[PDB]
Specification:
Layout lengths: L2 H7 L3 E7 L2 H10 L1 E2 L3 H13 L3 E7 L4 E2 L1 E5 L16 E7 L3 E2 L7 E2 L5 E2 L8 E2 L1 H10 L9 H6 L1
Parallel strand pairs: 1-3
Antiparallel strand pairs: 1-10, 2-6, 3-5, 4-7, 5-6, 8-9
């Protein structure tokens, strides 16, 4: 179902994460971690303290798709990334399935000039309504149990 997912997303904040290669997103899916440049690190740490859930929505450059989304479970703290980096965020994946950009063409992001939500620099914040609808478009990931994520909120 979608009900626990909607609960996790209620009043969340959303950020677009752009990776230049699939290897880094694979590492993040395997190890439950993400790292970003300090300008984005500072924004994510501020957001983590400010909201019930901070959701990272991942897209590999040139792939034409999102590769999934995850919830921050920690601030950054001080991984063989394919590359100055900041700390390491621990994340819990909510969906490890892909979503093609063709399916999100009706969603615009007011915080990026109402451009389609696929468009944005690494770290671009996605407004609440747009980000919620974007996450709800992903195919359900039946391997994930949101019970454990709910308890961390």
């Amino acid at each position: 179902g979608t009900s626990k997912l909607k609960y996790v997303l209620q009043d969340a904040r959303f950020f677009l994460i752009k990776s230049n290669n699939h290897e880094n997103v694979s590492l993040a899916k395997a190890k439950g971690v993400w790292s970003t440049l300090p300008v984005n690190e500072k924004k994510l740490n501020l957001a983590f303290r400010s909201a019930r859930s901070v959701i990272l929505i991942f897209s590999v450059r040139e792939s034409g798709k999102f590769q999934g989304f995850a919830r921050l479970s920690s601030e950054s703290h001080h991984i063989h990334w394919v590359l100055m980096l900041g700390g390491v965020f621990k994340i819990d994946w909510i969906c490890r399935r892909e979503l093609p950009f063709t399916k999100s063409a009706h969603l615009t992001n007011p915080w990026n000039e109402h451009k389609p939500v696929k468009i944005g620099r690494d770290g671009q914040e996605i407004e609440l309504e747009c980000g919620t609808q974007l996450c709800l478009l992903f195919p359900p990931d039946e391997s994930i149990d949101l019970y454990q994520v709910i308890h961390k909120m």
